[PDB]
């Protein structure tokens, strides 16, 4: 039944960020994908090209279309707003959702609800401090490289440029979760990064607790990027979920 595993990057990242994890899942017998979202491939136009969530997620819709069977969608950090949106529109194509220290927001709730300071257990003030506006775009603050590294990339045994883009579209921050009806019947899994300081473990829990209905959860002892510090443990739980998502 489950045929493809689709891994989806966070803000300012690219598909390639998952390089270490892809062949581990492939060994578990899956067609594994790590596409760039719209605006995330150098030479494609960048952040102003992204019209809306449909346009931003099209490279994932396209893959799901050629899928022989069912798919698991994984989102990292900001990626969770992409897989919630896709779930609404292709629930026939999706068998399961993985939120990897990602943004899981209740129906009709935007991700910014949890980036901005607020109560209870809201705010990502490390990221607001290191990611800055430009033009409608967001971009890291390159005057503080070591800070950029300990905060966003401390799990890397720095990463290579293939893993990143310069400018991020604001589209997925302001677009609210459209999941209704069948989409809420998809099994949901949240993988926590317990030592994350981008998205504090308290915010992660506040998001699991605020989503209507059950969320299965696995806890990883990682920081903002578990695909760097522990690909093997991560793939394993990803494949244990794709082996039978209704019962994990």
CA dist 84 and 204 (Å) reads 16
Yes or no: say if 18 and 25 are a contact pair by the CB < 8 Å rule: no
Yes or no: say if 120 and 190 are a contact pair by the CB < 8 Å rule: no
155 DSSP 8-state letter: T
Q: What is the CA radius of gyration of the chain?
A: 16
Output the six-digit token pair for 223.
């920081």
CA dist 190 and 153 (Å) reads 20
| 140 bridge partner residues | 131
Experimental method: X-ray
CA proximity to 148, closest of 132, 134, 137: 132
Q: Which residues of 129-164 are buried (b: 16+ CB within 10 A; e: fewer)?
A: ebbeeeeebbbbeeeeeeebeebbbbbbeebeeebb
35 DSSP 8-state letter: P
């Amino acid at each position: 039944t489950v045929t493809d595993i689709i891994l989806i990057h966070g803000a300012l990242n690219r598909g390639a960020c998952y390089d270490a994890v892809v062949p581990l899942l492939e060994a578990r017998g899956y067609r594994v994908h790590a596409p760039d979202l719209t605006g995330h491939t150098p030479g494609d136009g960048g952040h102003l090209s992204v019209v809306d969530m449909e346009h931003y997620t099209r490279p994932v819709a396209d893959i799901l279309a050629r899928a022989e069977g069912q798919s698991i969608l994984l989102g990292h950090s900001l990626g969770g707003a992409s897989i919630s949106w896709l779930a609404q529109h292709h629930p026939d194509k999706v068998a399961g959702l993985i939120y990897l220290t990602a943004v899981l927001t209740a129906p009709g709730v935007t991700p910014e609800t949890f980036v901005l300071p607020g109560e209870p257990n809201r705010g990502t003030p490390h990221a607001l401090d290191l990611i800055q506006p430009v033009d409608r775009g967001l971009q890291a603050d390159f005057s503080r490289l070591e800070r950029l590294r300990e905060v966003f990339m401390g799990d890397y045994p720095m990463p290579p440029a293939e893993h990143f883009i310069q400018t991020q579209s604001t589209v997925p921050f302001g677009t609210p979760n459209p999941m209704e009806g069948r989409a809420l019947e998809i099994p949901r899994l949240y993988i926590e990064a317990l030592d994350d300081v981008v998205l504090p473990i308290a915010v992660q829990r506040q998001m699991q607790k605020e989503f209507p209905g059950p969320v299965a959860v696995v806890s990883l002892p990682a920081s903002a990027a578990p695909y760097y510090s522990m690909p093997e443990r991560l793939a394993e739980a990803i494949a244990d979920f794709a082996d039978a998502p209704a019962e994990y």
